[PDB]
Design a protein around this ligand. Structure first.
Ligand code: RET
Length: 227
């Protein structure tokens, strides 16, 4: 096939794999229970992304959805990725500020809706309705971000400055990166079809890698992960 976006798929696979091994090696060396917890979660994130990026590279997770009078290429493998990686990243932040189970349940649930409606919209055949689902998915993300910024930040204040300061960084990187996904979707192949798939793939890999490996490097190198 040799699609124009394969090189970015290959780069995403490479970066996710390397980040996975590094976390794995670093994680199985630590003896602290709590640290192990964070390491197990943070290592699984890029591991899942690696498998999906590899699959897409190999030609899977791609489907032609008709709308706008075209046969549009929609990489659904991404949602198979985010469905598990998104909530896991949320869990890392939750464990960091000692969030409550109710909060975590609510966040993971909102994340489920976000990815769920997102995929449904990316698969919808009625052009205008694709944006209705997109809208609902974004509303769910805003809820998540609101909770992360107003709820979590507040409880991170009961933690030590080192833990609070580590969370602020992860929170910030998360808010900035996550906020970009809906925009890319809107102007990309799933939406207006303004930005070509090759470039679109480039944008998503940069966001995915930064939100997983970048997020992990920051979290796993901090002393805030220790019990
Ligand atoms: C490693 C992957 C991460 C951190 C992915 C985060 C993804 C989002 C915040 C995705 C959001 C979306 C919307 C707000 C609406 C349209 C569809 C999505 C799923 C692209």
């Amino acid at each position: 096939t040799g699609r124009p976006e394969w090189i970015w798929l290959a780069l995403g696979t490479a970066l996710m794999g390397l980040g996975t091994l590094y976390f794995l090696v670093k994680g199985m060396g630590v003896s602290d229970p709590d640290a192990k917890k964070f390491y197990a979660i943070t290592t699984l994130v890029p591991a899942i992304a690696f498998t999906m990026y590899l699959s897409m590279l190999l030609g899977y997770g791609l489907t032609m959805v008709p709308f706008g009078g075209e046969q549009n290429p929609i990489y659904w493998a991404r949602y198979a990725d985010w469905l598990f990686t998104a909530p896991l990243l949320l869990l890392d932040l939750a464990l960091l500020v000692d969030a409550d189970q109710g909060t975590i349940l609510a966040l993971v649930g909102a994340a489920g809706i976000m990815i769920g409606t997102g995929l449904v919209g990316a698969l919808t055949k009625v052009y205008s309705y694709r944006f209705v689902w997109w809208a609902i998915s974004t509303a769910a993300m805003l809820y998540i971000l609101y909770v992360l910024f107003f709820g979590f930040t507040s409880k991170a204040e009961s933690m030590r400055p080192e833990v609070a300061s580590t969370f602020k960084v992860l929170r910030n990187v998360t808010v900035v990166l996550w906020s970009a996904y809906p925009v890319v979707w809107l102007i990309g192949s799933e939406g207006a079809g303004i930005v070509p798939l090759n470039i679109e793939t480039l944008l998503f890999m940069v966001l995915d890698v930064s939100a997983k490996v970048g997020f992990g490097l920051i979290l796993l190198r901090s002393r805030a992960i220790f019990g």
